[PDB]
Write a protein that binds this ligand. Structure first.
Ligand code: CLA
Ligand code: CLA
Ligand code: CLA
Ligand code: CLA
Ligand SMILES: CCCCCCCCCCCCCCCCCC(=O)OC[C@H](CO[C@@H]1O[C@H](CO)[C@H](O)[C@H](O)[C@H]1O)OC(=O)CCCCCCCCCCCCCCCCC
Ligand SMILES: CC1=CCCC(C)(C)[C@H]1/C=C/C(C)=C/C=C/C(C)=C/C=C/C=C(C)/C=C/C=C(C)/C=C/C1=C(C)CCCC1(C)C
Lengths: 56, 112
C-alpha cells in the first residue's frame, strides 16, 4: 500500500483535509509556544537582571 | 473622621464599611490649642490610635545567597483591614529630664 514515508500524501489532493492538517500543525505550534512560556515562567528567576539576566 | 462624627454614627451604619479601622483626627476648626501639663496634676494618654497608611519592607535587591544590599519596597496588604491600633493609654511621668509616655494598655498590636 502506501509506505510509512508517503502517508501524508493522501491529503495532497484534498484541500479541505489539507486545511485540516495545517490547522492541526498550527494548533500544535501555538500550544508549544504557550507551554514553553509557562515552563520558562515556572523556572525563571526575575530577581537579579544585571548578573542573572534572562539569557543566563 | 472626627470623634464628634463617630459619636453620631450608630454601630449599624459603621459595621462592614471599613470606618472602624480608620484612625480619627482633630478637626481644623478645633485646633491651635495647647494641652498644658499643670504641676500637682498627673496626666495620661488615652485613645492613642495609629492607622498605618503605607507599608514598606526592606527587601534584598537580588536573590543572591550572599546579598547584603537592601532597599525599602512597597507592599500589598494581604490581611484585610485589621491593622490599625487603638485604645492605647498610659501615664505621663517625669522619668527623665523631660516628660515621657509609657505604654500600658490598649489593642496596641496588629498581626498583619
Ligand atoms: C513544511 C515542509 C514540508 C512538507 C509540508 C512536507 C511534506 C511531505 N514530505 Mg517532506 N520533507 C521536508 C519538508 C516538508 N515535507 C524536508 C525539510 C525534507 C528534507 C529532510 C523532506 C524530505 C522528504 C522526503 C525525502 C520525502 C518527503 C515526503 C513528503 C510527503 C509525505 C511525508 C510523510 O508522510 O511523512 C511521514 C513521516 C512520518 C510518519 C514520521 C517522520 C518522523 C521524523 C523523521 C522525525 C520526527 C519529526 C518531529 C516530530 C517534527 C519535526 C519538527 C520540524 C520543525 C522540523 C509530504 C508531501 C515524501 C514524498 O515525497 O512522498 C511522495 C518523501 O519521500 N519529504
Ligand atoms: C501535526 C502533525 C501531524 C498531522 C497533522 C498528521 C496528519 C495525518 N497523519 Mg500522521 N503522523 C504524525 C504527525 C502528523 N500526522 C507523526 C509524527 C507520525 C509518526 C508517529 C505520524 C504517523 C502517521 C501514520 C503512520 C499515518 C498517519 C496518517 C495521518 C492522517 C490522519 C489519520 C488519523 O486521523 O489518525 C493525516 C494525513 C495516516 C495516513 O495518512 O494514512 C494514509 C497514517 O496511516 N500519520
Ligand atoms: C480573502 C479570503 C481568504 C483569507 C482571509 C484567507 C486566509 C488564510 N488562508 Mg486562505 N484561501 C482562500 C482565501 C482566503 N484565505 C481561498 C479562496 C482558498 C481556496 C479554497 C484558500 C485556500 C487556503 C488553503 C489551502 C490554506 C489557506 C490558509 C489560510 C490561512 C493561513 C494562515 C493561518 O493559518 O494563520 C494562523 C491562524 C490564525 C491566526 C487563526 C485565526 C485566523 C482568522 C483571524 C480567523 C479564522 C476563522 C474564520 C471564520 C475562517 C474562515 C475564513 C478563512 C478564509 C480564513 C489564512 C488565515 C492555510 C490554513 O488554513 O492554515 C491553517 C491553508 O492551508 N487558504
Ligand atoms: C518554519 C518552521 C517550521 C516548519 C517549516 C515546519 C515543518 C514541519 N513540521 Mg513543524 N513545527 C514547528 C515549526 C516548523 N515546522 C514548530 C515551532 C513546532 C513546535 C515545537 C513544530 C512542531 C511540529 C510537530 C509536532 C510536527 C511537525 C511536523 C512538521 C512537518 C510536517 C510535514 C511532514 O509530515 O513532513 C514529512 C516529515 C519530515 C520532513 C520529517 C523530517 C523533519 C526534519 C528534517 C527532522 C530533523 C532531524 C530530527 C531532529 C532527528 C530525526 C532522527 C531519526 C528519529 C529519524 C514539517 C517538516 C510533523 C512531522 O514531521 O510529522 C511527521 C510533526 O509531527 N512540526
Ligand atoms: C511527558 C513527561 C514529561 C514529565 C517531565 C519528566 C522529566 C522530569 O521531570 O525530569 C526532572 C529531572 C530533574 O529532577 C528533578 O530535580 C532533581 C535533580 O536532581 C531531582 O531529580 C528531583 O527529584 C526531581 O524533581 O530532569 C531535569 O534535569 C529537568 C529537565 C527538564 C525536563 C522538562 C521536560 C518537560 C518539558 C517541559 C517544557 C514544556 C514545554 C514543551 C511542551 C511539550
Ligand atoms: C524529538 C525532537 C526532535 C527535534 C527537536 C527536539 C530535539 C526539541 C525534539 C522535540 C520536537 C518537537 C516537535 C516537540 C514539540 C512539542 C509539541 C508540539 C507539543 C505540544 C504542545 C501543545 C499543548 C500542550 C497544547 C495545549 C492545548 C490545550 C490544553 C487545549 C485545550 C482546549 C481545547 C482542546 C478546546 C478549547 C478550550 C481549550 C481549553 C483551550
Amino acid at each position: 500500500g502506501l509506505p510509512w514515508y508517503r502517508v501524508h500524501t493522501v491529503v495532497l489532493n484534498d484541500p479541505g483535509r489539507l486545511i485540516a492538517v495545517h490547522l492541526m500543525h498550527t494548533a500544535l505550534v501555538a500550544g508549544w509556544a504557550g507551554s514553553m512560556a509557562l515552563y520558562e515562567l515556572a523556572v525563571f528567576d526575575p530577581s537579579d537582571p544585571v548578573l542573572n539576566p534572562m539569557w543566563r | 473622621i472626627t470623634t464628634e462624627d463617630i459619636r453620631g454614627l450608630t454601630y449599624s451604619q459603621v459595621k462592614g464599611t471599613g470606618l472602624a479601622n480608620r484612625c480619627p483626627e482633630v478637626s481644623e476648626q478645633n485646633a491651635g490649642g495647647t494641652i498644658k501639663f499643670a504641676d500637682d496634676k498627673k496626666y495620661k494618654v488615652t485613645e492613642l490610635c495609629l492607622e498605618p497608611k503605607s507599608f514598606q519592607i526592606e527587601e534584598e535587591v537580588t536573590k543572591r545567597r550572599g546579598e547584603t544590599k537592601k532597599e525599602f519596597v512597597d507592599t500589598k496588604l494581604m490581611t484585610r483591614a485589621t491593622y490599625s491600633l487603638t485604645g492605647i493609654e498610659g501615664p505621663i511621668v517625669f522619668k527623665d529630664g523631660g516628660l515621657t509616655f509609657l505604654e500600658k494598655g490598649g489593642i496596641d498590636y496588629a498581626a498583619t
